[PDB]
Design a protein around this ligand. Structure first.
Ligand code: CA
Length: 123
């Protein structure tokens, strides 16, 4: 979950401190999400939100109250690449992949310092 996701982002964007730079970005980067994403970074977050939401409709994820933000999985970072571990059971493997996709997206889009701390009246 989170602790793991923060590391995935640091794996790809080494200079970052994720919970500081990507927290409260746009309408999607943070808890919840509503409106239209303000940019590509925000669209990344929207997508991940939809993935988590999707992890929910899976029989494999039904029995894990811990929640994906805190549903712990195994992965690795070796020379800036993320690898989800085969040892992850069905649900965690799916959440892992959602987080890998997002950390990769984040590293491929521009950061607009105009959208952090964005007021939720724009969503
Ligand atoms: Ca979100």
């Amino acid at each position: 979950a989170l602790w793991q996701f923060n590391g995935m982002i640091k794996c790809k964007i080494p200079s970052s401190e994720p919970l500081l730079d990507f927290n409260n970005y746009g309408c999607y980067c943070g808890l919840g999400g509503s409106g239209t994403p303000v940019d590509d970074l925000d669209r990344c977050c929207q997508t991940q939100d939809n993935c988590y939401k999707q992890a929910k409709k899976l029989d494999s994820c039904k029995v894990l109250v811990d929640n994906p933000y805190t549903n712990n999985y195994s992965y690795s970072c070796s020379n800036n690449e993320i690898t989800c571990s085969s040892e992850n059971n069905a649900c965690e493997a799916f959440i892992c992949n959602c987080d890998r996709n997002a950390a990769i997206c984040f590293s491929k889009v521009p950061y607009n310092k105009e959208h952090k701390n964005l007021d939720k009246k724009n969503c």
